[PDB]
RNA sequence: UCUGGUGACUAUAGCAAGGAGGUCACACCUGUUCCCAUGCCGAACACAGAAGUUAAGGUCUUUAGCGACGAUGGUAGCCAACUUACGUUCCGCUAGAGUAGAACGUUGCCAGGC
RNA sequence: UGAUAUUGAAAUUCGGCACAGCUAGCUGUGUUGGCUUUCUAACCCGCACCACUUAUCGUGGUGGGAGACAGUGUCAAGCGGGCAGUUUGACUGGGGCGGUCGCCUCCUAAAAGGUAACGGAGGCGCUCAAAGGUUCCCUCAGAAUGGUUGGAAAUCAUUCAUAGAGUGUAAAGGCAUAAGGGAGCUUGACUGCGAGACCUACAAGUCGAGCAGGGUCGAAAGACGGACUUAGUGAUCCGGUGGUUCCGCAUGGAAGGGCCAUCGCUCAACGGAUAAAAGCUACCCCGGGGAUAACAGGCUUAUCUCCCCCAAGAGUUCACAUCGACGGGGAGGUUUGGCACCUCGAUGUCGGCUCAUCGCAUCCUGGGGCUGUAGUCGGUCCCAAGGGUUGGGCUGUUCGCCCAUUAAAGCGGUA
RNA sequence: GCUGGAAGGUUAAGAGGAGUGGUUAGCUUCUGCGAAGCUACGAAUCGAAGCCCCAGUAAACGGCGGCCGUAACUAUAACGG
RNA sequence: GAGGGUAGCGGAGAAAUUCCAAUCGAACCUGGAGAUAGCUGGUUCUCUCCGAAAUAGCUUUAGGGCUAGCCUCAAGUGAUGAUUAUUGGAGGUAGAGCACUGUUUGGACGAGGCCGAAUUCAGACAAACUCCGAAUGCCAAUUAAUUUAACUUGGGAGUCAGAACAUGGGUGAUAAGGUCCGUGUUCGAAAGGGAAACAGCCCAGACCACCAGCUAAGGUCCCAAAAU
RNA sequence: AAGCAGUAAAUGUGGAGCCGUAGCGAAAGCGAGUCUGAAUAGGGCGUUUAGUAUUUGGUCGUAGACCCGAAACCAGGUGAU
RNA sequence: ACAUAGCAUAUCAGAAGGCACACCCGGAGAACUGAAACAUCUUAGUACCCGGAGGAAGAGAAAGAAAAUUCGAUUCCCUUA
RNA sequence: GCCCGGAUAGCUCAGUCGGUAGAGCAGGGGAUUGAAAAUCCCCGUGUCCUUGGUUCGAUUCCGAGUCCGGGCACCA
RNA sequence: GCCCGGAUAGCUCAGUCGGUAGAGCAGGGGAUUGAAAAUCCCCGUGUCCUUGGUUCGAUUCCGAGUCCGGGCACC
């Protein structure tokens, strides 16, 4: 409160409107794979229970920030396009 | 003194902003200027 | 206790900054400002270009000289050799 | 060296006067068909030319009378110190302006021809 | 005061609208509002009689009078200090009064920038389709000298003109490379931006080399993202119009939002409290201040009271017996003020009675000089505080005028 | 201000319902009509008192001027503009 | 005199703001209620270290607030901070001057039919007049000598009522212990010694003890230390 | 966390949730980078890893929020001796 | 005049008043204060007043939530925040 | 910134729905009659606001236009 | 000591928003008619208050200025 001079808060223009919805995927990282192994598949089910995500909002998008340095096999919700790449780089399917 | 808005006549809009000083040019006056998304100069028109 | 006459005028503008803001013999960057005047007090040299009326200042990089080329008109250059 | 072309030098270089020549190089003129054009006129701009002329421009040698530059000494002001309520002194550094001594009738780079 | 309900019947008309037929206008012809009346069952009668009952309330019947109006609800307009919540700016050598409130330019401002006052001077709330961009070319107001008209000066030439003119606007800084004046073309008075600076509490504010897309002018090199600069404007919120690859609450559309471009404010008290606002209190009330006045102390001496120089002149003659134009220099702190230093958790304020006490710039009395001093009176000046300094009319008076006296009816300080 | 006046302008609820938008039955199938239904809006026209308009009222509220010139010496004006 | 009525947005009034349970410009008693108060007064045990401001901008704002400025602990960065010599620079005051717009008193100079109308010589004046133009300060050397700061981030504030001297100035009357800016010092927040006493002037900064010595400002016959 | 057991035992269970591991933009959406944008040009905000739970201090916010003080307002009543 | 208001006897114990008015449910309902003033707003549907019950009153057996696969009367506690 | 009314003898009004311009006040000249005022004749010029278009033809219908009267005026 | 209105034929008023001066009373000369008064023609000079500046141009806008009318006047 300046003083009976008009507060900070009151020069600056509003903008925006945020959603009704606004679906937050849980971004696991391509890094956090690099832990386990037999490359059988990754899960909903599994993914949160070896504690890596955990209250995922909706789907579970692979952002591609680390190595994935295994021939690994996914099932995930949805994709980014460069970890896609690293996925089919050394092998594995999946079902978007 | 007289504000007014030239039209790009083939973007379908109004994009300037000039200063007719009514009654030395009251006439219509029309200009060459730039209109972008057509990338070209249209004639645009005082209205 | 008598009714005394009223003033008149008061009223004075607010204030510009003039005057030199770099100096003789520093290392200045080509963007930045040498001199500034409502006029021309100091003509460009090279390496040096007005703006509008006003504000001197350097196109590229190195030091600053001032430097009259007249006898009476003064000018401002900026050697980029080091 | 000298004549011309382009540079730098704060008019110390320029104006003001006076004498000297040639056009190998600038000018002056000979015209307007063309290149181009004068809110008009080819005086100017451009073009075509070379019989004349050094009077003029520009060049060169004198004149400090016009401006310009300009020292040594002084005096006013003044940062620091001291004393004092006086429109002040006193001591220690920097130091003009005007005015006089005067210097001065340009200097030097690079090109093409003598 | 209207609409519509309670709220019913009948007639007269005057309409617009839907159709026919004829001469823009009339007949029938159906919707369809109104307008006047006329009844009668609703409703009302502080309307007389009868019963509850012996009772002016009330309930019930009977006869009368009004009557589809009123009275009542619901919604809508105008009246409305009768009554209520409220606002009524600040700056200020105390306050109201007068004037001011933001931007631009000087000076004060003390050779960087900055820097106040109710200090001194001026402007603005725009204007220009060319007075913007480019390529070329030209140089001025004046001073002379003559020349149909004569402004002293409306054109024409010649010569000496360094800026003494001009720059749309007020001033300073600039400009004769023009940034001034003409002539040809044209829209860069563009779009997306921006390294880095200057200023600055913040929000704002200006200056930008170069980068891409599209150009204009020019032979080309280059210039151009408004006018020689610095003024000419106003946050947010909310709403309007034109686009929109964006969201659009089951899904698909819409309504609405958001972005991007733009308009509406003398919100001028200009960082704008709100969409909307003026006065008196001597009937006053509370919280505070000597931050801030009136009375009185204090500082200062403009005015004020006294001296004082200089000397023109007056005094028949002689400047100085007395008088002293024009001009200057000081003491006092008694008047009128200036400043706000002490006092607002109270320092009682004018005159008069009571009672004094102290200065001397002396009113009487004492002592002298000098007189344009015959004597008696009188003018002027020096030393002198010991003592004296009147009774009445008038007004609150101070002051003042007036009457009758006296040796005289002194001027002041002491809150 | 108050009373009196009745024509005209100016109005609100309400009565009216010319039309414009959204939606899809069907439809050219790319491409606008949209019948109908339901909904969002709503046009002229009608709709009183007030305010405009006219006239009256001061023992209602309220109001009840300036400037020059002139007379048988001067003075001022009965008077004039 | 006895009974009775009218009650707070109210009542009564031969009207005065009078009266309503020693009162009243709207009575009293509870409850909302610990109303709000930018305003006064008050706030309690001790010692070490460091220690300011009274200004700027904007406000229904001038005795209030918010931000920057000035202090403080804690981390960092760590040679960036301070003076001095050297060189190079920006700008137009004090001074000077009349070439510039302006103000001036003197001499000759022309410009009708007895006093005046452009220029020239010799002099002067200026905050808004400068052909000139210093002392100092001010920004920068990738400069060298000496010393101890500086800056970035994050917690905690306080100040926005200043005063007198010394000088450059406006206002005032070359008046004030006046007011308003610059710039220094001291007081505020600083005790001692000198100025007879005396916050602001002159010396100088108190950690405590001692019956020790030199010295500063002012003094040396006596009160009162020191030279008749 | 609530609850459920338990010397009103502070210990056992309860993984609903919160914060953090990835940001950018109004949003769709995109992702170690997006956003404006015609641009792979230039910019702003990010990336290279330390957060988290409880508590002793310092300070803010909502509550009366360092104490003590006003005239004054609005309800509900008692009073004409 | 037919009956009804009205009028006269006999039975009945239904009511009224009080409560801790602590808690609850409906009727009616202020202002001081905050916004640095104030009128929409907020203090708050809070305090006072009145009415009716209970040991608990109110709510309540979907014309609901939801959008995936649906599960399911009302109340209350924790998170969503 | 928005919707209408229109600029009709020198003054005031009239029709001015495309072939289709009127009044009264004023002015001038006669008459009156001692001289003016009245009073009575006889007269004229309009402007159909700037300008284009649907035009056999626009004072007349559209709008590129100047000025003023009636409502605008909303919760910035 | 303060804010406005202005000095507009000899008298009274008018526009007097920078190129852009009007009326009526008065005066004079004709006519009238026994003579004046009326009455009717035809005429003129204004002053745009002293003075400077923004001035293509100021009666016109500022203020160095004289006079008077409207409010000042506060505790
Ligand atoms: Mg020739
Ligand atoms: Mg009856
Ligand atoms: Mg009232
Ligand atoms: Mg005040
Ligand atoms: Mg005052
Ligand atoms: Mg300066
Ligand atoms: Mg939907
Ligand atoms: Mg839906
Ligand atoms: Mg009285
Ligand atoms: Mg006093
Ligand atoms: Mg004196
Ligand atoms: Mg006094
Ligand atoms: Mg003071
Ligand atoms: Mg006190
Ligand atoms: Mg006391
Ligand atoms: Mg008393
Ligand atoms: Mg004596
Ligand atoms: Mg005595
Ligand atoms: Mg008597
Ligand atoms: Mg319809
Ligand atoms: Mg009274
Ligand atoms: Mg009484
Ligand atoms: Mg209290
Ligand atoms: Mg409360
Ligand atoms: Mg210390
Ligand atoms: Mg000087
Ligand atoms: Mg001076
Ligand atoms: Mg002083
Ligand atoms: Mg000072
Ligand atoms: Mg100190
Ligand atoms: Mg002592
Ligand atoms: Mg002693
Ligand atoms: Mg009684």
């Known amino acids: 409160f300046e ?3 008009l507060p ?67 099932k995930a919700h949805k994709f980014s396009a460069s970890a896609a790449e690293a996925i089919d780089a050394k092998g594995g399917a999946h079902e978007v | ?17 000039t200063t007719k000083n009514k009654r030395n040019n009251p006439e219509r006056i029309e200009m ?3 209109c972008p998304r057509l990338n070209k100069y249209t004639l645009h028109r005082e209205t | 206790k008598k009714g005394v006459s009223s003033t008149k ?29 409502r006029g021309t007090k100091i003509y460009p040299g090279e390496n040096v270009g007005r703006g ?3 504000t001197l200042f350097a196109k590229i990089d190195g030091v600053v000289k001032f430097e009259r080329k007249g006898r009476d008109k003064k000018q401002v250059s900026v050697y980029a050799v080091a």
Do not use: H
């Not at chain 1, 900070?8 to 971004?27: D, M, S, V, W």
């Not at chain 1, 391509?30 to 070896?50: I, Y």
């Open chain 1, 8 to 74: 900070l808060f009151r020069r600056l223009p509003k903008r925006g409107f945020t959603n009704i919805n606004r679906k937050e995927y849980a971004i696991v990282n391509l890094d956090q794979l690099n832990k386990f192994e037999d490359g059988t598949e990754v899960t909903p089910a599994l993914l949160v229970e070896s504690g890596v995500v955990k209250n995922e909002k909706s789907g579970i998008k692979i952002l591609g920030n680390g190595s994935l340095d295994k021939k690994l096999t996914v």
């Open chain 2, 1 to 17: 003194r007289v504000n007014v808005t030239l039209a790009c006549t083939e973007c379908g809009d109004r994009n300037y902003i």
């Open chain 2, 32 to 34: 060459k200027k730039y």
């Open chain 3, 52 to 54: 509008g009326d006003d």
């Open chain 3, 9 to 37: 005028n008061g009223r004075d503008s607010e204030s510009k900054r003039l005057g030199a803001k770099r100096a003789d013999g520093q290392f200045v960057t080509g963007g930045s400002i040498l001199y500034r005047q």
């Open chain 1, 3 to 5: 003083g009976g001079q």
